[PDB]
Amino acid sequence: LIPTVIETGERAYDIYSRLLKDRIIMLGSQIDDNVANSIVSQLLFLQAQDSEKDIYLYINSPGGSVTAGFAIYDTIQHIKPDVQTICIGMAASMGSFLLAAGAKGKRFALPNAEVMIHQPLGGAQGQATEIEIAANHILKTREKLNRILSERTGQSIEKIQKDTDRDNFLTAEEAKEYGLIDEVMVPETK
Amino acid sequence: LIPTVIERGERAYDIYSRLLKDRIIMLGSQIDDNVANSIVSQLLFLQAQDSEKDIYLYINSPGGSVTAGFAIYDTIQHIKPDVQTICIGMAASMGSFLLAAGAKGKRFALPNAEVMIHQPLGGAQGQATEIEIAANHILKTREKLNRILSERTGQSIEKIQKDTDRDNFLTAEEAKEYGLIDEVMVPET
């Protein structure tokens, strides 16, 4: 149950609204349209409060809708502030795509976090012409995902295509070697 | 239930076994593997009884599996006897494909029978590459069906593709003009 937080009671908020106060956005669920619209609004709200201060996007999500993921992706690239990303626990599907889309040099993963990449999933039923339409669409969607992943990791599109043909699980250090993140966040002091 | 008929001498058969004794095969249900396997067996059995007498295929079917329909189609083309076809009631999907596959000049429809043609149906769920494999296969299947329909009707492949893009209902008279059947069977005496 979402706990209520008391600052210094004096002032009270739910935990996630208190995070937003520090310019932290929680992407901690499956990505559907509602989740994306919320995150888009939060990003635009933070830019309006300060168009130069970094924003922090916490990712612990199995992914979800590709179009919903691109709503968030395009909003990240449109705003002025750097958006840092960190994988907490797990990032798969569009979750890991967004992790890789954080400001260059500010993409992180905790030491035991897991990153998964794969090709998109879909579906089609009906006449042959309708199956062809869905196939052409999902294949075009895969090409768009692979091109951007190639641009943000430094790997070739051919390697991205090969490495996502099947479910591919990466450790935090492996995600750094791959170019999906920049640093494995080490503990501060203790 | 399936009635029993007596008769020549006093013999009792179920009505459909009696039909087979006159070299008539009833394709009167949705086409699945079990239906196709039975019809293939009946066709081969009739050819073994007499390799020169015509065979008669009665079609009142909404169609079904494409591969099951081709099992029947290939057996018709393989055996020596002519296989006559007649649409009674309705012939759709592979049912109308098999109606058009009868012996040239021996494909019929009763006056108020209906013929429907359309493109094949299918599905696909999974990774983008699995969707592509499923789409490529169903498109090849549609192309295979359309080529034969072009040969059997005399229409161009372009017209077959356009006319099967959506559900197309044809009257018996329209089916003859289209080339799916040769004659509308008219009431005798």
Next chain:
Amino acid sequence: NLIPTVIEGERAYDIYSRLLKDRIIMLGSQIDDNVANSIVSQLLFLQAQDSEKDIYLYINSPGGSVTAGFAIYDTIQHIKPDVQTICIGMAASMGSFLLAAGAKGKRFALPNAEVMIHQPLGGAQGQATEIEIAANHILKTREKLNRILSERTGQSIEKIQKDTDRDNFLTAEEAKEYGLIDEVMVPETK
């Protein structure tokens, strides 16, 4: 149901197979492809036994599939023997259509039988153009039915269209006055 068995020589038959020996065919259920295919076969079998003796079609049926009914209809008109019809209990939908398809002068109903006429039922779900295709098809079907009903009853096509717009229940006497049957079969005893 528990269909009783009758014994006669040396022949035991279920009650319905015994009927066929007298050239009587029972149309006593909803009309589907299975029922139509069996009745078409029975009609052809009876003609092969004797191409001149009348056949008798008993009808106690709510109707059913239009194409299944036409399989029977066309087989009736194709074969040489006269096919008499009689409504027992109720004839609705394609059941009353087939009742009216008997050899003229040999269509009957029992005094308390009911006949119902009405327009065909159908459905359509999908794109606008798919709905239009299904509508044009079921309208063409209704015209085909009304055309034939007009020929076999003597009513104008416009009258048939009007009387079948809604469910229309007819007594045996009214079915005769309407032209659906030729005579109400009355008891020749008390």
Next chain:
Amino acid sequence: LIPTVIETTNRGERAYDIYSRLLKDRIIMLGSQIDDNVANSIVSQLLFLQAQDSEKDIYLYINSPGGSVTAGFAIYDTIQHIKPDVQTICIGMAASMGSFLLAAGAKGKRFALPNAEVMIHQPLGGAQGQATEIEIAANHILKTREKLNRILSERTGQSIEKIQKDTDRDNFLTAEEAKEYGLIDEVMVPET
């Protein structure tokens, strides 16, 4: 469930199920809810028995809660059409269209066992849709009741007015009461 009876005959061992054995003695069992399948089978048996002998009586055993009105009329009209007298007897219970067919037997040959029950009521139905569709259904079911009440009046001797009151609600009658009403001619007293 249904036992088989075997009898040494002229042409050798012959086997019947108990219900087919009853039919060989011109006994027809109406012992279930009346649907189209039950009515069509009973219509076929009545015509078969008349073809075997057009003057010998037929015996219709009734233990049924009733059912479809049109199915019941298929049996009713077949009874009135054939030449042989059709006797009726209620065993256990005859309700709805069951008691209608019980009263439809040959005059003087309508019976009920001493503890059998007879029930009469008005027809049941349903209707869902536009107002004009409900009107069509209401007119039809009301016509059906008038038809049923008229024949019941002819079969029992009671006026149409009394039939309307006595069938407005479920009305249970004893065997003696049924005889009294005219639905049956005599209550069958124990054979010796």
Next chain:
Amino acid sequence: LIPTVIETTNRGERAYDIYSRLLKDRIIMLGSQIDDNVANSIVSQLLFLQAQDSEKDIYLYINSPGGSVTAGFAIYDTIQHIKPDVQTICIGMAASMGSFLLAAGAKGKRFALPNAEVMIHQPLGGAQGQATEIEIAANHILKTREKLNRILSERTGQSIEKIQKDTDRDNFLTAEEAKEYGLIDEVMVPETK
């Protein structure tokens, strides 16, 4: 849960739910399937914003698969009725009445993010019952498509014949393709990010 935003100002701390904060900047979120409830809320928001200021632009964010055609026309007719220009932007996806409403924004102020997708198609429906009932439903859904195609032709500049052919089946367009087609006026590009 819809998060709450705190605005530290020259007087202190103010709290709104995130969407009420969007409305304060004259931004309306069309981010779900379009049913009657969604349309009635958006119609109310458009009328409220015009009452607050009849000349400031309004911004309609669209990430929606579409839905009811009559619900979408409630929104369309309110956009055209009010005085302020209504800008539209496709975020993520605009399909069915979603892409129709995207094309209905003020001319020159219809946008899409670079990776957003636009889909156009013909309306969907159903019908079950008597033949004359099927005919009525078919006539109605076909008239609705003529209406949609007529307005879509006016908003895009394409002919009604081309729109009919291009919506016969599901048609997916990229942002640039939506601009070339005339459904949007500009692909909103990132300034250096």
Next chain:
Amino acid sequence: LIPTVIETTERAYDIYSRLLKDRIIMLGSQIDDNVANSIVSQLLFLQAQDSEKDIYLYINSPGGSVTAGFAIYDTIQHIKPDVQTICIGMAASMGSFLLAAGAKGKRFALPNAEVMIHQPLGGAQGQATEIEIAANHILKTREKLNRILSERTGQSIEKIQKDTDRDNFLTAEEAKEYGLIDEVMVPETK
């Protein structure tokens, strides 16, 4: 889902409570008893605040219960203020009945709005006399609705009966021509 509006000069309202402050009532759902009871209460509250200022009824509804619709209709006719009506999106069944019940000259429709008229729907299960009771009640209700519709539109009762036998869809312009509305509201400026 329902947004809250912040209005300068310290009040926060849900959007529908804000509409009521402008004497606007939203009939935007299927009409059941709860919907009617709330709308009746709103109408009485607005009259108590001001007995001469117009009230505005927004209609985007598929209709619903006839008695619930008449609860709204009778309250409209009872109160002193004029009740203007406008069809936005769609008005069918009791929805279109209430649209035509607005103050004469103040019944509107947006240009692309749809109006649907039809006869009432119902059901009946049981004894023959019970179905007769249900049928008599539905026909009475139809007459009532038709008679009022005739008075509100100027069309004869015979034409209303014919035009509502089946589902009848009308454009905004067709609704004006029929007399169900007075004006097609055209664009401010535009």
Next chain:
Amino acid sequence: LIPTVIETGERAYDIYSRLLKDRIIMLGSQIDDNVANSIVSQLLFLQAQDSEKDIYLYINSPGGSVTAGFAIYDTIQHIKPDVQTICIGMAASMGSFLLAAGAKGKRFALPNAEVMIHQPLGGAQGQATEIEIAANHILKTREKLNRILSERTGQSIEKIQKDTDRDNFLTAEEAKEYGLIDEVMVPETK
């Protein structure tokens, strides 16, 4: 419905028992244990009637259980008679594996028949040790299937592994080029 066949009635059998009389076995369903046990018994019965006469195995099946398929495979290889195979309509999964296991030179397909090859499918749920057990088992099963397929087609195991990684659909002529069958059965005369 399985029809009854009358020879010269005189003698009557169901259609499939009449086929068996000609040493024809129908593999026309999904392969489960019951189907395999039946076919094993039929093969042994035919060998007992004549240990030198060819046997004919008709295949129109989507496949099924791998162990059930190997029951049939091993019985084919154990008996003395040649077992001819023919793809009728479709053969996939173990169906196509059995098609390829027919006597060399007597493996056929009708011209429009389809052959599909793929890797085996399975499942596992539970502790990590149990998932490992199922994985090792299904991988071993794939190696056994690929080795035999390599022996009966002439292709290398590496090529079989590559070509079955995904669903692979072959035409009759393609199946012959691949080595899964020997001849495409052409029509005899007409």
Next chain:
Amino acid sequence: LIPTVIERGERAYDIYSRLLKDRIIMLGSQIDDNVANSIVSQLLFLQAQDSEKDIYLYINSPGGSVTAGFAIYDTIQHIKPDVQTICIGMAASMGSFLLAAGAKGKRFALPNAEVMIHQPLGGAQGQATEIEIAANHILKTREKLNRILSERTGQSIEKIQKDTDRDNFLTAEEAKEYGLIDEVMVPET
């Protein structure tokens, strides 16, 4: 329902927000992503309030998702304050993994609390190669968990593997001897 507590001055909190005011975090349910995200946020919020005061993590949980458990585990190791842990009632699966992850010398269990350890669970359905990918991943995950448990308890990897092969129930006293906790909290005054 969650009770409301009053109190110092007159202040009202729900009982769990009152716990957080004393730097106590309740891990009292099955561990899914939503639970982990909330606990990660509470840990970071407490560190922002005071980076030197201990934090107290109450555990009464059957466990749940392994990745969600590691989200909590990594946040505990990342922040500066010591995070104390105590098992109340029961700690199983990732719940017992997190109990063992507390600050050295500050991992507790009430006397009648239960600790269970076992290997991770999962599933897999599809082609042989998909089953292999799923098995390889869950085996790597089990190896990752076992390595940390070895470091946190002092037991060898061999013993951890044997002791988690099947469901293993431990008493509080047994959990201390095993090295999963440091002390059994005994009743005071």
Next chain:
Amino acid sequence: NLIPTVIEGERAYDIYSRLLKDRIIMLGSQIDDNVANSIVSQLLFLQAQDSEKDIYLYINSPGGSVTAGFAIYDTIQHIKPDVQTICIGMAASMGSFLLAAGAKGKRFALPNAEVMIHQPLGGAQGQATEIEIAANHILKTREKLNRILSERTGQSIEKIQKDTDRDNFLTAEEAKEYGLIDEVMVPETK
């Protein structure tokens, strides 16, 4: 349920929160982890308010999870304040165990309350060794419960084992005679 609200100064609280102000905790439902965690928190909160004043635990509960009950049990024995217990209505399973866990001399029941004791319930489905593990665990659990019950009632462990073999219903007076409570709380009025 509709929990009423009481008002008092200036404080409005639901009836259960008002109870806590008097150091009364309500254990009035089946015992699950959620209920246990809340009661543990309440106990610690009350001790933090005053480590010397008695706490009062009302019990009207069918029991539930054994581990959840022990969370409460151990918290009761850990804190300094005495915890009084009283059975209201019924205390069964872990509910009667916790009733017996109150401070000696301060365990009560209302005159017509019922107490039930019995052995724990559990399950086990799978391999022989898995069933043995679950059996040994639930037997160890029963010994732990019987050991403590023996200490707090004064009965031998063997007597407890015998009396809990089956469901055992006790009156308030019998619960006192058994040692589960210390006194039957009688009315100090009429």
